Design a protein around this nucleic acid. Sequence first.
RNA 1: CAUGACUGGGGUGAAGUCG
RNA 2: CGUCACACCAUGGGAGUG
RNA 3: CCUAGUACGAGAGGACCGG
RNA 4: GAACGUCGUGAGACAGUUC
RNA 5: GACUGGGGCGGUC
RNA 6: GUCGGGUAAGUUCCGAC
RNA 7: CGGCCGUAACUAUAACGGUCCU
RNA 8: GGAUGUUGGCUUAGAAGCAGCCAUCAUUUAAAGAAAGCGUAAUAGCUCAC
Lengths: 122, 141, 185
Amino acid sequence: TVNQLVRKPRARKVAKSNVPALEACPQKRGVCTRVYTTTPKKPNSALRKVCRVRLTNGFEVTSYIGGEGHNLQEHSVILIRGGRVKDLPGVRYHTVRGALDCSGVKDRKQARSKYGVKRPKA
Amino acid sequence: AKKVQAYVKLQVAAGMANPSPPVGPALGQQGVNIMEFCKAFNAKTDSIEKGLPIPVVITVYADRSFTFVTKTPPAAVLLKKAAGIKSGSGKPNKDKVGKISRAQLQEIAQTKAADMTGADIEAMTRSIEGTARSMGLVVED
Amino acid sequence: MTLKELYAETRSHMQKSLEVLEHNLAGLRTGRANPALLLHLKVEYYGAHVPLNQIATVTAPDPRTLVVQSWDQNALKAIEKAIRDSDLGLNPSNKGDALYINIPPLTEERRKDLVRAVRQYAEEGRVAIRNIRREALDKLKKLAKELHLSEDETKRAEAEIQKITDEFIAKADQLAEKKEQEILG
RNA sequence: CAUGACUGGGGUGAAGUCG
RNA sequence: CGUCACACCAUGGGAGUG
RNA sequence: CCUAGUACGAGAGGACCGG
RNA sequence: GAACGUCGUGAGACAGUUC
RNA sequence: GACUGGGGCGGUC
RNA sequence: GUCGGGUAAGUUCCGAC
RNA sequence: CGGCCGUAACUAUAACGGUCCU
RNA sequence: GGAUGUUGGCUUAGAAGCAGCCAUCAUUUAAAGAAAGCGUAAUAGCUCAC
């Protein structure tokens, strides 16, 4: 009621942005602690590739390394972007394909923007 | 047999010369003219005999000019060809790599006769035998 | 048991603990900085195939860099064209009258992280050996009662077990310290 | 505000033991 | 569902240290 | 420190004797 | 002087520790 | 209780 | 005792286990 | 108001299993 | 004075009396080891046996 509202109105709701590498950024630089190959959840199978990252802001976190061809090292510098992954819990990030000291998918001719490819052998 | 003068000795193949490792640097250090000798040596060696390694004694002068005398092939080499083998015993007398008839020994003794001191043929043969014994080559008499 | 068997067993056990310690320590990250590695390579020197050792030397001043001095300059070239893609996959650099062939480095921070691990492995050996002395003393206590050994006998036996202990402690110290210097070099 | 032997709980994971 | 193994992630407590 | 960055050494390095 | 562990039926004791 | 390379422990009478 | 602290170096000391 | 033994992903530990006597 | 086959064979990048292994004969002789030590990258060269 108006009275009950004048006293204690309508409270908001602090939107919880699922992302440690916040700082309101499109991406963040890392260092890569190691390269894992953890298994997915119960519904899916096949081992995916991941890797712990030592973000520039200290905030460590494992990022996904999508693409049909990994090529990262235990010291290579990659760039985190975002977009979590279901099958892989705690892995709510992905390493930019074709940036920093990382590599990029090979022989890929579709969806070049994404992954590491820029105008094929023509 | 005469006054000793600076000079190098080496056994080079009959018709071939000038490679650095085999010759070149060997006498080249002396001040010898490799090119002249290679052509000069091969010149007479074709006539004397090709296919057989012949030792030659190069004598260089202060002019760094030089001369050389072509003698007969070593006893060891002639015995090797006579034996029909490529190399010596490795362990002479213990293991016989080949054999030579006494007749052949006489032949080799004949060939090297010019270089040999032997007063008689029998003598030169006996000297040849010495080499054969050292190379694991027996002689059938 | 008897005293003799107690000693024999104790000494065996401690030796075995020392062997677990030896194992934990004996690994090292050197294994490509070897100088003998490159002697098999046939080097083109004046169009001939002279073995690397007869034309050059390979020294290591540390197991981080490897320097290859080659008597002749032409030979040094043909040595370089073999260090890399062959089966080694190394990277020679032409730097001076010798090829500097870099082997993977290790930062000083990781060097700290390594020396502590050595001391942890060291401690696993020593603890095991002292626990065997302790256990040996316990076994000697039972043994003493069981065989009705006198106090003096038991003190003589304690001294014997202790003497065996100190040898394995000494051997442990030497192992750790040597491996530490290898890591730090 | 940074950091620390050790320590508490939380979260993921791959899913193991025990029910 | 909750221990208890592990492996990572962030975080409270802490002799104190900067 | 001078001898002497010399002898020695591929470099790296680095004396003797004497002061 | 007192106490712990150990030991001795006990007085006490220890090539143990502790104030 | 004694013997005891002091005595005691051990051992023996 | 072991780890941490103080010290150029600490069988004492302080904080832990 | 207990013991002895075997045991999981690098070891080490062993939640787990066994077994003897309460 | 100490020669010739001969730098003996093997080995070796080289090993020619003299790193090492095997052999250690024969010729010319007044004498001359397939060589005793030094030495050379190897030769050379020096000294020794006789």
